[PDB]
Amino acid sequence: RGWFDILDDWLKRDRFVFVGWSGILLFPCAYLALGGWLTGTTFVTSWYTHGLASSYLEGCNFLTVAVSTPANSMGHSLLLLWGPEAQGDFTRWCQLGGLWTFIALHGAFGLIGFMLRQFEIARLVGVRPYNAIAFSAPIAVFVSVFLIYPLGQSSWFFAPSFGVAAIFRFLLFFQGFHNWTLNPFHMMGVAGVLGGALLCAIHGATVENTLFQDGEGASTFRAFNPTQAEETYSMVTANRFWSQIFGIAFSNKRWLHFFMLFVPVTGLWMSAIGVVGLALNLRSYDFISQEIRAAEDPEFETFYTKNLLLNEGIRAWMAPQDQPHENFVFPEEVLPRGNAL
Amino acid sequence: SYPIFTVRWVAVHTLAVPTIFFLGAIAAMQFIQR
Amino acid sequence: GTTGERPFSDIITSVRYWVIHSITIPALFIAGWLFVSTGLAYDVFGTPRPDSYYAQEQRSIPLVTDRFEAKQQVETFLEQLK
Amino acid sequence: ANLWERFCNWVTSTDNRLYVGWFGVIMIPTLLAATICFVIAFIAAPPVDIDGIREPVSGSLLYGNNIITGAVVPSSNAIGLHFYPIWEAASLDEWLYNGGPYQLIIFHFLLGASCYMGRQWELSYRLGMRPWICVAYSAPLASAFAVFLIYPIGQGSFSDGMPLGISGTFNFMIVFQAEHNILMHPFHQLGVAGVFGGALFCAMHGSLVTSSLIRETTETESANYGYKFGQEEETYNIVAAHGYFGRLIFQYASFNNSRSLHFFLAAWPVVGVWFTALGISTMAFNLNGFNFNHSVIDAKGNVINTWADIINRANLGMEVMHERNAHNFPLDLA
Amino acid sequence: ARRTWLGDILRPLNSEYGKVAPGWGTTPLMAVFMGLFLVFLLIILEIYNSTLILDGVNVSWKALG
Amino acid sequence: DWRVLVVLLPVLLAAGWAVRNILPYAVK
Amino acid sequence: MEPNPNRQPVELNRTSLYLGLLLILVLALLFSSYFFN
Amino acid sequence: EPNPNRQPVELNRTSLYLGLLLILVLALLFSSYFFN
Amino acid sequence: METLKITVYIVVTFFVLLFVFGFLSGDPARNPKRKD
Amino acid sequence: METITYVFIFACIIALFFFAIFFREPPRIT
Amino acid sequence: METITYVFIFACIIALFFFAIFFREPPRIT
Amino acid sequence: GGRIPLWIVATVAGMGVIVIVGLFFYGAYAGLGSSL
Amino acid sequence: TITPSLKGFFIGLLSGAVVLGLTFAVLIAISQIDKVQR
Amino acid sequence: MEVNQLGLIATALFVLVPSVFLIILYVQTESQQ
Amino acid sequence: MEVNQLGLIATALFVLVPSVFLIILYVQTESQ
Ligand code: CLA
Ligand code: CLA
Ligand code: CLA
Ligand SMILES: C=Cc1c(C)c2cc3nc(c4c5[nH]c(cc6nc(cc1[nH]2)C(C)=C6CC)c(C)c5C(=O)[C@@H]4C(=O)OC)[C@@H](CCC(=O)OC/C=C(\C)CCC[C@H](C)CCC[C@H](C)CCCC(C)C)[C@@H]3C
Ligand SMILES: CC(C)=CCC/C(C)=C/CC/C(C)=C/CC/C(C)=C/CC/C(C)=C\CC/C(C)=C/CC/C(C)=C/CC/C(C)=C/CC/C(C)=C/CC1=CC(=O)C(C)=C(C)C1=O
Ligand SMILES: CC1=C(/C=C/C(C)=C/C=C/C(C)=C/C=C/C=C(C)/C=C/C=C(C)/C=C/C2=C(C)CCCC2(C)C)C(C)(C)CCC1
Ligand SMILES: CCCCCCCCCCCCCCCCCC(=O)O
Ligand code: OEX
Ligand SMILES: [Cl-]
Ligand SMILES: [Cl-]
Ligand SMILES: [Fe+2]
């Protein structure tokens, strides 16, 4: 027995928490990403990068704490602890935004580790690797939003900050600056997410209301046996119901469960593509035909033009505080405002 | 017999130990005044 | 059904478990308390205290604006409060 | 042999390609009326004075819209919550200007969708099924009531109901955020958890069942042909699925009971969407998301901004621009 | 199968399907080269990133003269 | 500085306490 | 020279036809506004 | 209830070729007039 | 407009009565197991 | 021309619904 | 666009010639 | 080995969470983050 | 011409090697003591 | 409205070319039996 | 050249529709 094979043996022992070779990458990176977020949201400010308080220590609550992005002046610096910006000073590293890159990069390698773990366990147990494949969607979203998007922009400053409210701000930024709701790739993402939740609900309800009476109890959970070969619910009755209610129904259980994989995974992949475009400000911002008409015809009004006015409000009213490095000074008289408000 | 110290034991304490510490620190914060 | 570790429900109802953890849990809580009550948390992480966000006659944010001098800018700003 | 009882037998027949049923007797005419009016208005309705300020908004394709910008526009703020059927207008021209079709469509639709839910109960009873699929559909149904009926009732006007259009929807969302800070409202946060979690568990369940299909086919044919409609044997090995998922996390975080599993699949998104529908329905009465605006101040009293104050700046820009001609007084109280 | 003059000349280059060196063979040497290449790519990345700053290496357009 | 031992003392003492109470079975 | 043994027939069932047509038509319905712009 | 009058339909390869040539040449002829 | 109003009133009354009388026509018995 | 295109595609989708429901491949047991 | 269209159609015809000659259905005696 | 009943472990642990969480909501109204 | 940042690069490089070498030293040790019996 | 005139042929081919592909495959499936 | 813009779609459809018809018929002839 060679040393490599003995380490393999140990890594792959059946224990309460399986380790694997993938564990060597996953477990440190996941725990560090998670610990960095808890550490930063509990103790670390965003005063010097953002002009914001962002920790429990400072008075924030669970909704407003964040690990915020580094200052725009850092560009796309890796912001290594030992790098030229922090120069090994942990305190300054925290104050400059180093925990952001720390979490994002450890988080990325942790995500790789997790998908490798899905591959590793699937190979050991003898199943097909479709759960790993499905997980590619969360990966694509993470890299496109947290990494590719800021890399096309001026700096990590414009990536999402890791916090509840900070992400809310990210949503609103994308509306006002990118008109992201108008983007067909986001729309396909919305359909895959909302379609997935629909499939989840309708499949679970269907199964639960087409059960075979396999026991005498009023609690029907007891009448299932994980080793029984029989289907626990009637595909035939399910199919009849939905055919008569909705017009069409599933008839093939394999297609049904593949479709459940397909819909949300595809939707997430589509949204990631749109965000790659927004990395370059390659937006679906306008319809040219609408703008030509509206410039010429002051009586022409649509929900599209109404929403651009809202975007314009968002940009002028949030930019000075949201982008402090720009030193925007907008006197009262230049702020867009409707009547009275 | 059952072993005391396991990989499981480590994973549990890797999380539980700092959780309680953080909880104490966040408790103290509720009495900070400006 | 089991991988040989000791059942959790057996552990947390055990006398020995609570002999140890009735010490270790409050001790950790108190350690974290003191980390804050002593002011150490502020100094480790560089987080401003309520009196240290601004200088007395100052409503400008001490925003880092250089990449390679950033460390010195923060230090310059902190000395403007001593 | 009696005419009424034969009609009753056809209405409730389980042999009709589409089930009719007593709920269907109401659903079919009301959905057809809503559908036909909707299609015609979307294509050809003239511009509608949504905000009652004689500033008509063009919603239809023939008046310069595309599929993304087009909408059936809500009825005039001048009408408020007044019932505006056709026969109350002096002319169809008037009815179209003031947004009549919106009312016709949403009332017929909400009635028809309600009956759709009852119809789901009804056929389950005729088929000897358990009855609660209709309870799953009450979550989307409740959400449509919230944006088409409850929110207008609370704000006093169908002009603040959700427009029937893609860009109109986004307009409704943005205004809602400025006036209610819905993102900072826990019931919407639960909606996101219901919908993100629903999509997660959809993919999880689909991938775990797909991962454990039993080999029944060759590499040259779709694996789906390994399942035959109505076969008695399960088509995947749930013990292998559990053996994988329990090791991916740990044993007791994985279901081995398919009934509990599918009940969980049903319950998570339904309950999340109930909450988000209740979110809209209670923000209808202006019980709004958390307000942490200027909650953090320093020893001297300077405001120390948090991410919540940045949200607020965005909300302000939405507030001051929306319906830019419609406010004469300084507070937008509805 | 069809023989051709060109096929007869190339034949030996497609004649050892499945032939392996025993055990680990050159795997330890491969690992060394992989590690060197990782450090080398790290360097190149961190130069581009301006995390590694070297004398006479101006990472700017202004290095075109 | 001094605050660091104030913080670390309950930890070490708790660690010591568990060491004493468990040493016999850890041996096995 | 013998005929090629690797040839296989290809299939698309009616349900796949309906699913694929719906996908294409809905995609067209979605993107056409952006193509006309 | 199967209908007995149904018949399979055929287009042989030569007819494909002739038909495709007809359509292409017709398009080559008329396209100038379509562009005008 | 009054002709329209009358027509709709009549159409709605008719459907609603179908609904009420249909469900009063022994609906519990219209299932596949016990009819009582 | 754009209006015609939008309504044409929409109409094709409605027609597809008809075929998919009434001219589906019939599900057949075992 | 019109030049591209004319050349495209002509190029398809040349391709058709290739298939019509070399991938014809072979005439067989019988 | 099984000395302390688990329902008692659960009640005391449960109450302990109610306490810490309550403290955190109290602190929303006092001191830092209270708006005062 | 060995600048501060090149020095930091080497610091990061050694730190990483220590972390991975220490980790693998420990995993090899444990695996050798606690073998699977076949 | 001043739309991109090439949007028509773009849309027409976007519908036509994939649809025809599927019809071709479906009809030759049916005639196999 | 100021040609008719509808000329392009007329020509494209003139070629595509009839050609697709023939291809559909030919392929399903081959598979029986
Ligand atoms: C799976 C483990 C893992 C992985 C993948 C990472 C990955 C990363 N970490 Mg994390 N880290 C880990 C574990 C890990 N870490 C652990 C356990 C800790 C706690 C100590 C940390 C603490 C930590 C900190 C504090 C920081 C990182 C940082 C980083 C990043 C830069 C790493 C780098 O430049 O390496 C460089 C080094 C290597 C790639 C090693 C290569 C090995 C070489 C080839 C061999 C050397 C030969 C030797 C010297 C010759 C011997 C001769 C002798 C006789 C002298 C990257 C995202 C930084 C970061 O996140 O930036 C924001 C950062 O500041 N890590
Ligand atoms: C109907 C409403 C609706 C719906 C359903 C969606 C749906 C979506 N949006 Mg859109 N959005 C909407 C409205 C909506 N949006 C509106 C009105 C706006 C304003 C313009 C936006 C603005 C917006 C932005 C700005 C972005 C989206 C994005 C997304 C996608 C998120 C994918 C995902 O799950 O990311 C969640 C994240 C992941 C899956 C990443 C990996 C996560 C790992 C696995 C986490 C592991 C966690 C760890 C183990 C545990 C942590 C513990 C700790 C919490 C305690 C999805 C397609 C994102 C997108 O398109 O991305 C490509 C995006 O960036 N939306
Ligand atoms: C990633 C970001 C994100 C995410 C994931 C979400 C997610 C969600 N939001 Mg939030 N939102 C966001 C960002 C986000 N939002 C932002 C940035 C803003 C501010 C700009 C808002 C503002 C906002 C508002 C104002 C509202 C939401 C609502 C919702 C929900 C929409 C889904 C729904 O209502 O299903 C419920 C299901 C339905 C609505 C479907 C009803 C279906 C009916 C019954 C039948 C339809 C039949 C149909 C016409 C015909 C089919 C024909 C057949 C042939 C196919 C969901 C929980 C909505 C909500 O909570 O609604 C209650 C809501 O009103 N959001
Ligand atoms: C916000 C939404 C969202 C979250 C929170 C989430 C979370 C998760 N999904 C997982 C899995 C999945 N997700 C899937 C599909 C999807 N997932 C989706 C959306 C999400 N998925 C959607 C919409 C889909 C549909 C396609 C699949 C198919 C799977 C799985 O198989 C897997 C699983 O087992 O689920 C049961 C788990 C992976 C665990 C892991 O990587 O551990 C290791 C932990 C690591 C590597 C740490 C990551 C650190 C991250 C990247 C950065 C730092 C994050 C901070 C700590 C917290 C920030 C919080 C603020 C932003 C508020 C985890 C519970
Ligand atoms: C510098 C100095 C010296 C410092 C040194 C510091 C130091 C010590 C650092 C090194 C640290 C070190 C030792 C590292 C190791 C530590 C370690 C082990 C860390 C712990 C790791 C950790 C942080 C990360 C893990 C967290 C995590 C990812 C948790 C996620 C859990 C989660 C949300 C679970 C969901 C489970 C759930 C029930 C989902 C249901 C989904 C669903 C319905 C599935 C469908 C489904 C399910 C089935 O079940 C079956 C059957 C079928 C059919 C089916 O459809
Ligand atoms: C970063 C860093 C690092 C690391 C660190 C770590 C790793 C940490 C960790 C940390 C941690 C690990 C933490 C923890 C915390 C926790 C917490 C803080 C919790 C809380 C919770 C709560 C609050 C909850 C509550 C609740 C609710 C709400 C409901 C239900 C119930 C309960 C109770 C759950 C180092 C050193 C390397 C260096 C560099 C930097
Ligand atoms: C791949 C695994 C990588 C592991 C990385 C662990 C990193 C621990 C390094 C902490 C050392 C910081 C020392 C700072 C000294 C910098 C001096 C200088 O910048 O010139
Ligand atoms: O209409 Mn629609 O939107 Ca509910 O607030 Mn007032 O009003 Mn109007 O303003 Mn803001
Ligand atoms: Cl508006
Ligand atoms: Cl007013
Ligand atoms: Fe299922």
Side-chain angles (χ1 to χ4, degrees), chain A, chain B, chain C residues 1-81, chain D, chain E, chain F residues 1-5 7-28, chain G, chain H, chain I, chain J, chain K residues 1-29, chain L, chain M, chain N residues 1-32, chain O:
Chain A
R1 269 273 149 174
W3 66 268
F4 179 92
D5 298 291
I6 291 152
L7 178 56
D8 190 69
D9 286 345
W10 192 87
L11 288 167
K12 288 167 179 169
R13 293 229 289 176
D14 215 12
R15 38 165 78 90
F16 188 90
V17 186
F18 174 93
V19 184
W21 289 97
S22 47
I24 299 157
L25 180 62
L26 164 63
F27 279 115
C29 285
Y31 181 71
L32 261 40
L34 172 62
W37 188 70
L38 296 159
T39 294
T41 56
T42 299
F43 296 116
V44 175
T45 189
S46 306
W47 192 235
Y48 304 104
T49 64
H50 276 82
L52 303 169
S54 61
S55 60
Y56 299 130
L57 178 53
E58 289 174 285
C60 292
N61 62 55
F62 169 65
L63 297 175
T64 60
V65 295
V67 178
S68 296
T69 55
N72 187 68
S73 61
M74 302 295 129
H76 306 94
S77 171
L78 291 173
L79 256 175
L80 308 183
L81 173 51
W82 54 87
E85 302 89 1
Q87 306 175 14
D89 187 322
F90 170 86
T91 292
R92 304 276 172 282
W93 182 65
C94 284
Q95 298 168 318
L96 292 187
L99 280 182
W100 192 88
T101 52
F102 175 95
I103 290 162
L105 300 172
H106 286 91
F109 286 105
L111 287 170
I112 294 166
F114 190 87
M115 186 166 178
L116 287 174
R117 171 185 186 84
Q118 297 169 304
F119 276 125
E120 182 166 32
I121 286 163
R123 188 68 262 190
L124 302 186
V125 160
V127 299
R128 308 157 93 210
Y130 283 86
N131 177 235
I133 296 167
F135 194 71
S136 72
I139 288 186
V141 163
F142 183 79
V143 299
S144 72
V145 171
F146 287 86
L147 293 173
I148 294 175
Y149 175 72
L151 286 167
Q153 296 289 340
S154 60
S155 75
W156 303 119
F157 182 88
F158 289 100
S161 294
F162 296 97
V164 177
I167 288 279
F168 298 162
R169 163 266 174 206
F170 191 76
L171 303 173
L172 298 186
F173 186 92
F174 268 49
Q175 174 56 45
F177 284 88
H178 294 311
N179 210 9
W180 179 222
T181 43
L182 207 72
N183 197 296
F185 290 101
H186 185 248
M187 297 171 170
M188 291 189 278
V190 168
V193 165
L194 294 177
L198 182 166
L199 281 170
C200 189
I202 204 168
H203 174 57
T206 293
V207 169
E208 283 300 283
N209 290 280
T210 55
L211 301 176
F212 286 114
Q213 185 180 346
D214 285 335
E216 299 150 0
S219 158
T220 58
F221 299 99
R222 291 159 184 186
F224 180 81
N225 171 20
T227 63
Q228 78 189 45
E230 300 77 24
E231 60 171 1
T232 195
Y233 68 95
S234 173
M235 188 75 19
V236 171
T237 284
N239 169 271
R240 178 113 182 183
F241 177 80
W242 282 118
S243 295
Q244 289 188 274
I245 286 302
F246 193 53
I248 55 119
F250 288 105
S251 75
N252 188 299
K253 274 201 186 190
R254 287 177 176 212
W255 166 241
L256 189 166
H257 291 84
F258 177 83
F259 195 70
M260 287 186 76
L261 183 175
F262 181 81
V263 162
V265 168
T266 298
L268 254 62
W269 267 99
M270 288 306 99
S271 60
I273 293 170
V275 173
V276 174
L278 302 186
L280 312 178
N281 292 336
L282 214 55
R283 310 158 176 164
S284 78
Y285 192 88
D286 47 8
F287 293 115
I288 292 175
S289 60
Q290 297 263 311
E291 297 300 357
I292 292 170
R293 170 74 181 272
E296 284 167 4
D297 178 0
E299 267 172 287
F300 178 70
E301 180 165 21
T302 68
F303 275 107
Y304 161 85
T305 61
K306 283 163 63 60
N307 292 338
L308 300 191
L309 292 162
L310 301 179
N311 292 349
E312 284 150 34
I314 294 167
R315 291 194 298 265
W317 284 72
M318 93 180 287
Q321 308 74 14
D322 185 62
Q323 299 181 43
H325 52 279
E326 296 279 10
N327 296 117
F328 292 131
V329 176
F330 299 159
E332 287 193 35
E333 66 195 69
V334 322
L335 295 169
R337 296 178 86 159
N339 199 61
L341 302 186
Chain B
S1 198
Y2 283 126
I4 308 295
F5 297 105
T6 63
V7 176
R8 188 184 81 179
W9 190 97
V10 176
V12 166
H13 287 84
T14 282
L15 302 154
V17 162
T19 291
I20 304 308
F21 181 93
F22 273 62
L23 288 174
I26 301 165
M29 290 170 200
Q30 308 312 315
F31 304 102
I32 297 176
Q33 311 288 315
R34 72 187 175 89
Chain C
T2 175
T3 40
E5 298 98 340
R6 186 171 168 219
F8 279 116
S9 44
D10 197 87
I11 294 163
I12 69 205
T13 65
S14 81
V15 265
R16 185 176 72 197
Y17 175 82
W18 279 115
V19 164
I20 291 152
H21 291 90
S22 66
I23 279 65
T24 68
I25 291 167
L28 291 178
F29 190 92
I30 270 290
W33 191 293
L34 294 165
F35 187 55
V36 167
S37 60
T38 60
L40 192 60
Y42 295 105
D43 298 324
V44 166
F45 292 104
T47 295
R49 287 179 176 82
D51 60 355
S52 322
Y53 282 94
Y54 292 103
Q56 188 50 42
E57 298 313 322
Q58 193 207 310
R59 288 182 211 82
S60 65
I61 308 298
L63 203 64
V64 166
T65 66
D66 193 79
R67 178 175 174 175
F68 298 112
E69 301 300 336
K71 189 183 181 298
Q72 293 51 66
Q73 289 180 343
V74 169
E75 264 136 28
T76 302
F77 293 125
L78 297 188
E79 286 344 289
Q80 282 170 346
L81 320 173
Chain D
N2 155 261
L3 161 66
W4 170 253
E5 180 47 29
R6 163 156 40 271
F7 178 70
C8 282
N9 280 322
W10 174 85
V11 168
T12 61
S13 165
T14 50
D15 290 348
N16 284 329
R17 176 62 182 81
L18 300 169
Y19 180 73
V20 180
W22 300 116
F23 282 105
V25 172
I26 306 301
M27 182 188 79
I28 287 168
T30 56
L31 291 185
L32 285 168
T35 295
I36 290 155
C37 186
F38 175 76
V39 164
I40 292 168
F42 197 89
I43 297 174
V48 169
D49 187 27
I50 176 173
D51 289 324
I53 51 172
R54 316 300 174 75
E55 182 191 310
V57 169
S58 174
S60 71
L61 298 181
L62 291 171
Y63 285 78
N65 279 276
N66 63 37
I67 285 283
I68 297 303
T69 74
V72 180
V73 180
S75 57
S76 174
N77 196 43
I79 296 170
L81 293 175
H82 282 237
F83 190 56
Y84 190 51
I86 299 185
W87 50 85
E88 282 284 309
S91 69
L92 272 173
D93 312 80
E94 170 201 308
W95 189 71
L96 295 173
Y97 181 90
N98 287 285
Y102 184 80
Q103 282 199 21
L104 188 149
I105 299 160
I106 57 158
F107 301 151
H108 282 88
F109 164 77
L110 287 172
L111 204 44
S114 288
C115 289
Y116 192 90
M117 184 172 64
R119 175 160 171 277
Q120 283 176 331
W121 160 77
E122 190 177 332
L123 182 64
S124 80
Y125 185 73
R126 316 298 188 216
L127 298 189
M129 284 167 59
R130 281 148 49 87
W132 297 305
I133 285 161
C134 68
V135 176
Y137 179 73
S138 78
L141 181 55
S143 310
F145 271 93
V147 302
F148 295 143
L149 189 65
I150 303 319
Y151 188 72
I153 284 172
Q155 302 299 305
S157 181
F158 286 112
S159 65
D160 275 348
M162 193 180 94
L164 311 186
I166 288 163
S167 292
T169 295
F170 309 146
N171 183 80
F172 174 87
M173 296 172 86
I174 296 165
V175 180
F176 213 98
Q177 164 62 22
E179 298 182 334
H180 301 284
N181 208 357
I182 175 154
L183 292 171
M184 298 290 282
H185 190 296
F187 282 9
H188 179 262
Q189 297 165 10
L190 294 169
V192 178
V195 137
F196 278 172
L200 204 168
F201 303 139
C202 186
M204 283 298 306
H205 179 66
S207 71
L208 294 169
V209 170
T210 296
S211 293
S212 49
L213 297 183
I214 293 159
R215 181 157 57 239
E216 213 77 56
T217 58
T218 72
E219 332 292 318
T220 42
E221 56 188 317
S222 167
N224 295 334
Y225 289 118
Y227 169 85
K228 279 74 172 69
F229 174 66
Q231 73 177 55
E232 293 204 54
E233 326 87 276
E234 197 45 81
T235 191
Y236 68 115
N237 181 343
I238 188 173
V239 168
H242 176 60
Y244 164 87
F245 187 52
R247 289 183 176 83
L248 182 68
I249 310 302
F250 49 87
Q251 176 167 7
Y252 307 111
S254 175
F255 295 91
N256 48 37
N257 181 333
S258 183
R259 292 176 175 210
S260 312
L261 167 55
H262 283 92
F263 167 72
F264 182 77
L265 292 178
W268 179 280
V270 163
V271 174
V273 170
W274 280 340
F275 279 114
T276 202
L278 293 174
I280 303 297
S281 302
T282 51
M283 284 178 269
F285 307 106
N286 308 321
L287 181 65
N288 295 332
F290 290 118
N291 182 338
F292 301 122
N293 296 334
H294 298 196
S295 284
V296 182
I297 63 185
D298 77 356
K300 176 183 193 193
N302 296 296
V303 178
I304 306 307
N305 286 325
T306 73
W307 283 113
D309 301 284
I310 305 294
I311 295 166
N312 201 39
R313 299 300 302 177
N315 289 353
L316 279 158
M318 295 167 222
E319 157 188 322
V320 301
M321 284 315 300
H322 81 302
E323 303 170 350
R324 68 210 179 276
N325 294 317
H327 314 93
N328 301 162
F329 307 119
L331 308 176
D332 186 14
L333 295 175
Chain E
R2 191 177 203 210
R3 271 173 103 252
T4 81
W5 168 82
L6 182 54
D8 288 352
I9 287 159
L10 296 184
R11 181 71 278 192
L13 301 174
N14 192 43
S15 71
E16 301 192 282
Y17 175 76
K19 290 237 281 73
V20 294
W24 289 102
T26 43
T27 298
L29 183 64
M30 185 186 72
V32 174
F33 282 114
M34 291 184 66
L36 284 167
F37 192 51
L38 170 60
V39 173
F40 155 79
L41 280 182
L42 262 167
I43 294 174
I44 286 166
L45 169 60
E46 300 187 9
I47 292 164
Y48 215 145
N49 193 247
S50 297
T51 284
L52 184 60
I53 300 134
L54 302 177
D55 278 304
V57 184
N58 181 28
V59 182
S60 179
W61 296 99
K62 291 208 101 298
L64 296 167
Chain F
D1 64 72
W2 69 268
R3 302 169 302 176
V4 189
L5 201 272
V7 173
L8 277 169
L9 203 83
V11 179
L12 298 142
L13 298 174
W17 175 257
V19 170
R20 263 58 196 180
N21 277 89
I22 207 65
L23 185 50
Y25 318 93
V27 165
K28 275 90 181 298
Chain G
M1 179 155 139
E2 57 168 39
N4 187 290
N6 301 291
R7 289 258 342 90
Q8 288 285 354
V10 47
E11 67 151 87
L12 183 87
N13 58 34
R14 198 194 301 181
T15 293
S16 295
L17 174 68
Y18 293 143
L19 284 163
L21 290 177
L22 184 69
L23 170 64
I24 291 152
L25 288 173
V26 171
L27 285 179
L29 192 59
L30 175 63
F31 277 92
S32 58
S33 296
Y34 303 89
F35 296 167
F36 289 112
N37 198 7
Chain H
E1 10 161 337
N3 185 298
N5 306 305
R6 164 136 144 61
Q7 286 293 118
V9 64
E10 69 155 74
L11 188 81
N12 59 28
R13 187 185 304 178
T14 295
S15 297
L16 174 72
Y17 287 156
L18 295 159
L20 251 28
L21 184 67
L22 174 66
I23 292 158
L24 294 169
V25 168
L26 275 176
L28 196 56
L29 201 226
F30 274 96
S31 55
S32 294
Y33 302 91
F34 294 167
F35 285 119
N36 204 1
Chain I
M1 291 298 193
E2 282 281 308
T3 300
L4 210 213
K5 188 185 177 177
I6 281 147
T7 307
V8 173
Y9 273 58
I10 286 164
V11 176
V12 167
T13 301
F14 171 75
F15 281 106
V16 169
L17 291 183
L18 287 187
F19 178 84
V20 173
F21 288 129
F23 265 130
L24 282 169
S25 294
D27 197 80
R30 299 180 194 275
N31 73 85
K33 299 285 145 184
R34 324 195 205 297
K35 338 202 190 338
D36 90 334
Chain J
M1 110 192 335
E2 63 275 21
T3 291
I4 289 159
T5 303
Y6 301 137
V7 168
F8 167 75
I9 293 163
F10 174 79
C12 289
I13 291 172
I14 299 308
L16 173 61
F17 289 175
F18 180 75
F19 288 104
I21 289 167
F22 293 104
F23 297 104
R24 61 173 186 175
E25 4 199 19
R28 294 274 172 260
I29 311 282
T30 52
Chain K
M1 42 170 45
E2 71 274 22
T3 301
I4 293 164
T5 296
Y6 303 134
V7 175
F8 171 76
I9 294 161
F10 168 82
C12 297
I13 290 164
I14 303 306
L16 176 60
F17 291 169
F18 178 76
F19 287 96
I21 292 169
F22 296 103
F23 297 107
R24 66 172 172 176
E25 44 198 346
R28 302 290 187 188
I29 304 138
Chain L
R3 304 293 223 185
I4 305 115
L6 198 53
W7 76 269
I8 284 168
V9 170
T11 305
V12 168
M15 275 155 145
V17 174
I18 290 161
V19 173
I20 305 216
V21 159
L23 184 56
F24 296 163
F25 277 99
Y26 159 77
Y29 298 98
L32 297 191
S34 74
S35 75
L36 307 182
Chain M
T1 73
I2 154 78
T3 66
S5 68
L6 184 59
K7 176 183 176 174
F9 182 90
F10 286 131
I11 287 155
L13 215 56
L14 281 36
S15 300
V18 166
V19 164
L20 310 171
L22 207 147
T23 301
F24 272 97
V26 162
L27 291 177
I28 300 277
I30 293 173
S31 70
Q32 286 293 341
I33 297 159
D34 187 9
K35 307 192 182 189
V36 296
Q37 327 309 155
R38 284 190 170 93
Chain N
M1 315 271 285
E2 301 185 42
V3 295
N4 183 347
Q5 292 251 327
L6 286 184
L8 184 64
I9 187 172
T11 305
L13 304 187
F14 186 104
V15 172
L16 220 58
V17 167
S19 300
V20 160
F21 170 67
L22 301 178
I23 295 162
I24 287 159
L25 246 39
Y26 170 69
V27 177
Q28 64 86 44
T29 303
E30 290 298 85
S31 77
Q32 286 171 48
Chain O
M1 301 298 277
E2 287 182 37
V3 297
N4 177 9
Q5 290 298 257
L6 287 181
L8 180 63
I9 186 65
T11 300
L13 263 355
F14 187 97
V15 165
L16 292 190
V17 166
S19 298
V20 155
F21 171 77
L22 297 180
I23 293 170
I24 290 163
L25 291 185
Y26 168 71
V27 175
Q28 62 93 45
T29 297
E30 284 298 340
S31 69
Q32 48 191 359

